Amino acid sequence: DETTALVCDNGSGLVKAGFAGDDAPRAVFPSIVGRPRKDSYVGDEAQSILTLKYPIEHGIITNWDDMEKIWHHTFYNELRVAPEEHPTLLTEAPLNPKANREKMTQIMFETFNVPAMYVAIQAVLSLYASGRTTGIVLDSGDGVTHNVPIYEGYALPHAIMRLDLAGRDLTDYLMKILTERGYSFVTTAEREIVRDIKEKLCYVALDFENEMATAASSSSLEKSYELPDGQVITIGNERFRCPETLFQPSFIGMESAGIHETTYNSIMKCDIDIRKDLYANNVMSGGTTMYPGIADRMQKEITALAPSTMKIKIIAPPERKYSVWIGGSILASLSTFQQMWITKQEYDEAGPSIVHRKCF
Amino acid sequence: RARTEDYLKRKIRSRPERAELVRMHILEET
Ligand SMILES: Nc1ncnc2c1ncn2[C@@H]1O[C@H](COP(=O)(O)OP(=O)(O)OP(=O)(O)O)[C@@H](O)[C@H]1O
Ligand SMILES: C/C1=C/C(=O)O[C@@H]2C[C@@H](CC[C@H](C)/C=C\CC1)O[C@@](O)([C@@H]1CSC(=O)N1)C2
Ligand SMILES: [Mg+2]
Numbered sequence: 001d002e003t004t005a006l007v008c009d010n011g012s013g014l015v016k017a018g019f020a021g022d023d024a025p026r027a028v029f030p031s032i033v034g035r036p037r038k039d040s041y042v043g044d045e046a047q048s049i050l051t052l053k054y055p056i057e058h059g060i061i062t063n064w065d066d067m068e069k070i071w072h073h074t075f076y077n078e079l080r081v082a083p084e085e086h087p088t089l090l091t092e093a094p095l096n097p098k099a100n101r102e103k104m105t106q107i108m109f110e111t112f113n114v115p116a117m118y119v120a121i122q123a124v125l126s127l128y129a130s131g132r133t134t135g136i137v138l139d140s141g142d143g144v145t146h147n148v149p150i151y152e153g154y155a156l157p158h159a160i161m162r163l164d165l166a167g168r169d170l171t172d173y174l175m176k177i178l179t180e181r182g183y184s185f186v187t188t189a190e191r192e193i194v195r196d197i198k199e200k201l202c203y204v205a206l207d208f209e210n211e212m213a214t215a216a217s218s219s220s221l222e223k224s225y226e227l228p229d230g231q232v233i234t235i236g237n238e239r240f241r242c243p244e245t246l247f248q249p250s251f252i253g254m255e256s257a258g259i260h261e262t263t264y265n266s267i268m269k270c271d272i273d274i275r276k277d278l279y280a281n282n283v284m285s286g287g288t289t290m291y292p293g294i295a296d297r298m299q300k301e302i303t304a305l306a307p308s309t310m311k312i313k314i315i316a317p318p319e320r321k322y323s324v325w326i327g328g329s330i331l332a333s334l335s336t337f338q339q340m341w342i343t344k345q346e347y348d349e350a351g352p353s354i355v356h357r358k359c360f
Numbered sequence: 361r362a363r364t365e366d367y368l369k370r371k372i373r374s375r376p377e378r379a380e381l382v383r384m385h386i387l388e389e390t
Contacts, residue, residue: 130361131361131362131367132362133375336369
């Protein structure tokens, strides 16, 4: 792997980084810089006393100095590569400002001296990971959720929906509701515990009102979770109330439509003659789409909104937590893509704005 | 993951130009 192209998917929560042609990212680490509450600690150095900063908020880079620290860490600490040896594919959020795209390009070529690079939209890569070039992606990670309709690789910006509700908000909501049975989780470390509970025990009910009316009865619903220190907590309806928030954002006092509604609204902003192709190709990607039941719930909800004749297919791969990265690995490994890299020579001649003409 | 990259390569190789999507009203002019 001395010169294998690199693929880096910079999330609000996790960096996923690795080598093109691999089936999974070699390195997955938190997108944080930590400082004493030695001057700074990046990624897992910080996770291991410190106040944390996330340089990407809701998928958009908002702290460039710390982002540069994150990229440095990715190359020198995590992947341990000389960046000059590797074409590098980066990812970006849908609707990323042009200035941001340019700055990422400038940093990669001028600061890290990469020989070639490219920037692709995260949702487009997830779509490609499924083998498709047309469809509508629900991409939901730690910091942001989007519905992104894509036709032949082009995201359709007028139809893109952004919702700030994503995994971090769901953790915070689970912390709040766990206060009802009386379990207090408060600190940054305790928030991580509740993230883990969310990931291990939460699920999306097919029929929420019925699941509530039932919980109240049964139970295989109640589940126990053992804390690091050996004590146990038990959770019941919180298991499915937490991610229900994706369908009912009013649970956290947000006025937004839920993700089934936003998917439908996004499809309805697209030309009518491509809608059938969108419905038949709804891809889910990102960690917050990992809840058991969420694909069946979306299928039910979209079916209820869509024309009754419409073929609806939700594609929710088991690796979807990494589908963006995987689609980058696949794309950067294709013969077809090699002509598409921005080369250092091209950058020298055209400057950072070359990204707009080459990455689309 | 897709069972093959074969159709993906063929789709990329025959990808329409942006101007065509605009003419078709799939994309807005920009
Ligand atoms: N099994 C799971 N069930 C539910 N949520 C999960 C699961 N695994 C991970 N998550 C959540 O997904 C989030 C991380 O996902 P991901 O890496 O896709 O986000 P990101 O790319 O860093 O963020 P974004 O794309 O929003 O900028 C966290 O909130 C994490 O708790
Ligand atoms: C295992 C893991 C998962 C994750 O998604 O981590 C990311 C990044 C992380 C950074 C702080 C944490 C202390 C460091 C590492 C945990 C990384 O913040 C998150 O856990 C935030 C806070 S709680 C939540 O759901 N998202 C998401
Ligand atoms: Mg992401």
